């Protein structure tokens, strides 16, 4: 943290600031240009692959490789070795239920909380529907409150419990901590989905008392696209099965069969992006610099002037009214019209903002609603923007 | 088609003026107007994808879309067959997870023998696991492949995959060849093109292939982290998506889940936008220069590489056949450990790669250490080859 301007600082750094009011952040996040200048000098000034390669760029590329790692590993409180890169969190889960398959012995229990994101509970849908076993869901309510003594209950006996730590379409900040406790008490293998999490709040695999965790760079941490990361506790390096092998995976091989290398290697198959990875770095510093405390209070004041702002115009918004449990996404509705019309008329005013399901069906339905419209934030948004955003949505709602 | 000087194209790589860059198997150099093509993606039209109602979604799925598109006319196929993976071997395993429920008991399969891990390791997992018959097609050492044991160990097997070419030996298989063995004999035929995707013709109707892998980061002069997955239209109904979740969907509920249409029902997550556009513009950046130009410039740098590594009496390998040689040579000077070699010819700014190379029944096969390999892209000019022979002169003595 070195005492600099929010947001004008970090506006500085993204020219789409001055074109546009871009409230789409958990879609994805704009991307400054430090994120884009250290991605530049690996592809025109040390491209090379890794795999500790003889020539001096192959010593770079794979210098700056593994410190990206060790840089993704210490953003989240993890060892190095226990630091996959993926292609994003799709990927991360889709591992953790391939990866584990293996151990579940039919009628096993998983557990997940209604409001997931479509990957962390289609994974699980398949590898239940395939396995037999019994796939249950905690309640909660409309607002994205879980039901914590009904996690108490439905967590006894599972053998994995999967859940993510913010909503991508109500903003619920769930209490993870409690639910990994309550994991590790039961026996539990605890999985964390932290894609709208990563970079916008403290995500740490300690607190957590996370086994598997999965984030998505092109998101909060203002890294590129195509880098996700798995995390996979030291502890499961001798049940986790590596779905995916093949070149730098392994430390013999023949015509006969494989012996394959050690963690995170074991894992990794073929050239990773590395160009991805050091982008994905470059975020975590840029972040890391800002400071997530800084970011949380920015978003947090975002949420409050949005929510009083709908609020004064008769306009609905979804997820918790207590703003302490509440991310920098804010989920709403026009009356008489659909999301897609409200976000077409705000990108008519060069504001950015998405509308439909989200990847999220299943909480569109326990809500009994055709869709939201979302606006979200990172800690480039300004006050100005969120006046102007309520000034067309005044002049929207008092056309009706 | 058209309209230019090899090898420059060097105006375009910054690098190519500090090093000679013999290291294109592993990776290629990238030119400035590939790097410029995802630098407007980030800092001009960031954003998803899915169709989104905002001008910048709009603006990126377009431009996704389009990259799709390019890709797909690069290799002959249609827009729906074509899946982005983070890199081949994400692809080739792909294959052998979407469709594992087809096998039963004592099925074959048939590789070459040589073969990057890649496209090994998922064929070696597959067969212990659900108890197949993994078969090797026959070879001499120069890594030509009999014709005559292909058409005996095809019939009558589910499926067969190989290499386009070989990244230790560089021979370019004779696949259009085996494709309609496999095609005849009603077998699955998938094409490992991670090496010939940007330095020769890949075409899928000419190569008969049902499955494709290549990687951009290779011979197409892209980014890191883009790979695809040609998946012909014939095995949509067949074919099982090993990853799914966001964007792969037409209904999902508590219950359950339908899945959508192909190419997206193959795709989960936010792609690779920056990496596909990224793709697209090396694409672009190779069709300009011609398919036929890059072949003919490598042919070149492989002539004079081996006819003075001849003169210079250190031993190479691949095939002696020149037209069966890609722009790849593994050599070895006698009494000296390929990477001593490898770090003398760092030591002289010439980029090179030594080891095993993930091949190695290739290194057994063929018993030997391991292998120095000089491998080359249509930047690459002949009087870079001229100077590497000279280190390489001044080291045999």
Request: hydrophobic share 40%; net charge negative.
């Amino acid at each position: 943290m070195a005492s600099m301007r929010i947001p004008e600082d970090v506006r500085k750094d993204i020219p789409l600031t001055n074109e546009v009011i871009y409230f789409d952040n958990t879609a994805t996040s704009l991307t400054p240009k430090p994120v884009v200048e250290a991605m530049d000098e690996y592809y025109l000034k040390y491209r090379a692959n890794v795999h500790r390669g003889v020539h001096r760029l192959s010593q770079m590329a794979t210098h700056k490789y593994e410190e990206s790692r060790k840089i993704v590993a210490d953003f989240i409180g993890a060892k190095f070795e226990e630091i996959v890169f993926t292609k994003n969190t799709s990927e991360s889960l889709n591992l953790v239920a391939l990866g584990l398959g293996h151990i579940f012995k039919r009628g096993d229990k998983i557990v997940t909380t209604p409001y997931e994101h479509h990957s962390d509970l289609l994974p699980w849908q398949r590898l239940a529907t395939k396995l037999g076993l019994k796939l249950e869901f905690i309640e909660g309510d409309d607002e994205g409150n879980l039901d914590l003594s009904d996690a108490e209950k439905k967590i006894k006996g599972a053998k994995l419990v999967a859940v993510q730590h913010v909503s991508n379409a109500l903003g619920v900040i769930h209490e993870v901590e409690e639910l990994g406790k309550i994991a590790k008490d039961e026996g539990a293998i605890f999985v964390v989905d932290a894609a709208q999490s990563a970079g916008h709040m403290e995500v740490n695999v300690k607190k957590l008392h996370a086994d598997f965790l999965a984030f998505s760079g092109h998101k909060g941490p203002m890294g590129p696209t195509g880098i996700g990361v798995l995390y996979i506790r030291e502890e499961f390096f001798d049940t986790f099965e590596p779905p995916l092998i093949g070149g730098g995976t392994i430390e013999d091989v023949s015509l006969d069969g494989y012996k394959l290398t050690e963690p995170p290697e074991r894992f990794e198959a073929g050239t990773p992006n590395i160009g991805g990875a050091i982008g994905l770095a470059a975020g975590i510093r840029y972040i890391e610099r800002i400071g997530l405390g800084r970011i949380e209070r920015q978003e947090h004041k975002l949420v409050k002037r949005t929510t009083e702002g709908l609020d004064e115009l008769e306009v609905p918004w979804y997820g918790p009214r207590n703003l302490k449990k509440h991310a920098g996404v804010v989920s709403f509705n026009v009356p008489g019209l659909h999301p897609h019309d409200v976000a077409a008329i705000l990108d008519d005013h060069s504001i950015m903002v998405r509308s439909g399901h989200h990847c999220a069906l299943p909480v569109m339905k326990k809500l009994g609603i055709n869709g939201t419209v979302r606006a979200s934030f990172h800690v480039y948004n300004s006050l100005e923007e969120v006046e102007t955003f309520l000034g067309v949505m005044e002049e929207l709602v008092k056309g009706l």
